[PDB]
Amino acid sequence: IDLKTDKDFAELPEGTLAELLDGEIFMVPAPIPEHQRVIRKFSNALSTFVEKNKLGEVFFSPIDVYLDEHNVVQPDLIFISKARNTIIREKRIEGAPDWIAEILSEGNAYHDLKTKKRLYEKHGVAEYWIVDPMERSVEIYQNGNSGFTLLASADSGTVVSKMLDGFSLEIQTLFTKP
Amino acid sequence: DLKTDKDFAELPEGTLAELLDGEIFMVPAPIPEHQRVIRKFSNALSTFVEKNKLGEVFFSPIDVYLDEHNVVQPDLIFISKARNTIIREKRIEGAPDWIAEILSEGNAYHDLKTKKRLYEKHGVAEYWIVDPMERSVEIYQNGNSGFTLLASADSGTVVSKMLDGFSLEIQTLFTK
């Protein structure tokens, strides 16, 4: 009866990084450098492939993605196809991206693993990558007529996208350092 | 009554802010065009750094501690292998070799002035200021007398001094 809405989410004080999940507002903790390293490496690989094949647009956090009145999320890495370009608005994304990756944080992984997995499934995100920098592993889910099914789960070798035909990723290169 | 990095560390979870000259400023959330410019710049820079095995690139949000009265969240940073030890578990402790800030209309003063002085003082060797409203770039080179203007352009290609061989066609950062 007291669900928070996108209007409540918009009224948060300037300088607040939060997400609205199932009508509840959650503060997101500041990420640590290793989390940012992984997003940088993933975005570089994804952006290069998207740009070479003119597939659409890549964004990374912070960026608001409105899904419905009770759900506004800030995914780590998103891809929006040319066909769905109109969901990119002046101040946020309005509608589900085609493709999302979340990079886990040890103290805040439940929403990536459970709550947003269901949300992204419901709203038709076609492919969802969950990257775990603590286990140095990836899980890939593909959407379909019966929701998400596990496409790949690995901490070694190469994983390939299904919806981004030709995109592959050598998993251990997400986590390496000088 | 100056705020310190101890006060900064005690801001409530979910707060993204900067500590500048001992005063805490909230940073407004960025808009998609800002994030698009960082994505384009990060891709170009990261490709070059990786190709040449030069160090590490990070983009915001990331805390960069400079001294007890200054903790910044720069948009894009490069840390050479030579300065590799400033990468800590929860933040950067010390000045990156290289920084780019992407201006926002309502919040540009700190990038243009306040942080320009701080990055100069703390030994950032090269500082790029990218303005997506005017679609322009300014590049500052540090030196024994502080920053000097290496380049100011809104067309053509600009060349980095400290990233030897890195160049950027300026209008590829921007939307027409």
Ligand SMILES: [Mg+2]
């Ligand atoms: Mg998150």
Ligand SMILES: [Mg+2]
């Ligand atoms: Mg994350």
Ligand SMILES: [Mg+2]
């Ligand atoms: Mg800023």
Ligand SMILES: [Mg+2]
């Ligand atoms: Mg900025």
